[PDB]
Every structure is written in structure tokens, then in C-alpha cells.
Amino acid sequence: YDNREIVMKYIHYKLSQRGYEWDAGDDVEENESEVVHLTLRQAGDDFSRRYRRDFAEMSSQLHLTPFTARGRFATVVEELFRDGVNWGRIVAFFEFGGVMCVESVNREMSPLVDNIALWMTEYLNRHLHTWIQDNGGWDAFVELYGPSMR
Numbered sequence: 001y002d003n004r005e006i007v008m009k010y011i012h013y014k015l016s017q018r019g020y021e022w023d024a025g026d027d028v029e030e031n032e033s034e035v036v037h038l039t040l041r042q043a044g045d046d047f048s049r050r051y052r053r054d055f056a057e058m059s060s061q062l063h064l065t066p067f068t069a070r071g072r073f074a075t076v077v078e079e080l081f082r083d084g085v086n087w088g089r090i091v092a093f094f095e096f097g098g099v100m101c102v103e104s105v106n107r108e109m110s111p112l113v114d115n116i117a118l119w120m121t122e123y124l125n126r127h128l129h130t131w132i133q134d135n136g137g138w139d140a141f142v143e144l145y146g147p148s149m150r
């Protein structure tokens with residue numbers, strides 16, 4: 001699976017469900033990966049429900065600006081992974097990136113979406129890929145958290 005594609009499709013779906021058409025994502029949508037994208041969306045929606053009130057507070061705490069957005073992303077993701085990697089923290093990472101993109105559009109800072117997608121792709125490639133592959137890959141994520149009987 002292509003980790004950039006996972007990031008792009010996740011962000012694009014999250015934005016499109018708010019009525020924002022992200023052109024980079026529009027061209028991504030035009031090109032069993034679908035089960036991975038779907039399962040990640042479902043897991044992220046479940047995470048955001050479990051943490052709904054904390055997410056509302058975070059949206060108030062992001063303090064997004066063009067010149068500090070990268071540092072906000074860096075601070076949050078470093079703290080999220082301080083105790084190591086697992087599937088739930090990977091889902092949290094995706095949902096956080098999605099919140100950052102939604103907030104960027106809502107605050108008239110839409111260019112940041114492209115930057116956030118890059119930061120997420122690079123973070124996944126540099127920090128999360130070894131763990132993912134050592135733990136059965138995205139196929140193992142789907143087996144654990146997809147539609148199969150638990």
C-alpha cells in the first residue's frame with residue numbers, strides 16, 4: 001500500500017464531507033486498498049466519537065497560523081507517540097491531521113492543507129512504517145478493526 005495515497009484519500013474524504021473540494025485530492029480520487037481506506041475512515045469516526053469533547057477543545061486550542069502550523073503539528077505528533085506506536089495512536093494521528101486540515105479551511109488558511117498532507121506522509125514514512133510492517137501491515141489493521149467478527 002502507498003502511504004501517500006492513504007493520507008491523500010483520508011484528507012480528501014474528510015474535507016469533501018464538509019463541502020471543501022481539495023483539488024490535489026480530486027486528482028487522487030481519479031487514479032484491496034479500498035478496504036484499507038474504508039476501515040481507516042470507520043476507525044477514525046469511532047475515535048472521534050469516543051473523544052468528541054476533547055476534539056472540540058483541541059479545535060479551540062490549535063491556534064492555527066501560517067507560520068506556526070508546522071510547529072503545532074510537530075508538538076502534537078511528538079507527544080502522541082511519546083510512549084510508542086500502536087494502531088489506536090495511528091488512527092489518532094490521522095484524525096488529528098484531518099482536524100488540522102478542516103480548521104485550515106475554516107480559518108481561511110486553505111494552502112496549509114497541502115503542507116499538512118506532506119507532513120503526515122513524511123511522518124508516516126519516517127516513524128510509523130517500520131512498526132506498521134512489523135505488525136502485519138495495513139491488512140492486519142483491517143483484520144482487527146474492519147467488518148470481520150471480533
Ligand SMILES: O=C(NS(=O)(=O)c1ccc(NCC2CCOCC2)c([N+](=O)[O-])c1)c1ccc(N2CCC3(CC2)CC(N2CCC[C@H]2c2ccccc2C2CC2)C3)cc1Oc1cnc2[nH]ccc2c1
Nearest residue numbers: 042043046047050051054055086087088089091092096145
Ligand atoms: O485503544 C487504543 N488503541 S488500540 O490499538 O487498542 C485500538 C482500539 C480500538 C480501535 N478501534 C475500534 C473501532 C474500530 C472500528 O469499528 C468500531 C470500533 C483501534 N483502531 O481502530 O486502531 C485501536 C487507544 C490508543 C491511544 C489512545 N489515545 C487517546 C488519548 C490521547 C493518547 C492516545 C491523549 C490525547 N492527546 C492529549 C493532547 C492532545 C490529544 C490528542 C492528540 C492527537 C489526536 C487527538 C487528541 C485528542 C483526544 C482528541 C490523545 C486512545 C485509544 O483508544 C481508542 C479507542 N477507540 C478507538 N477507536 C478507534 C481508535 C481508537 C482508540
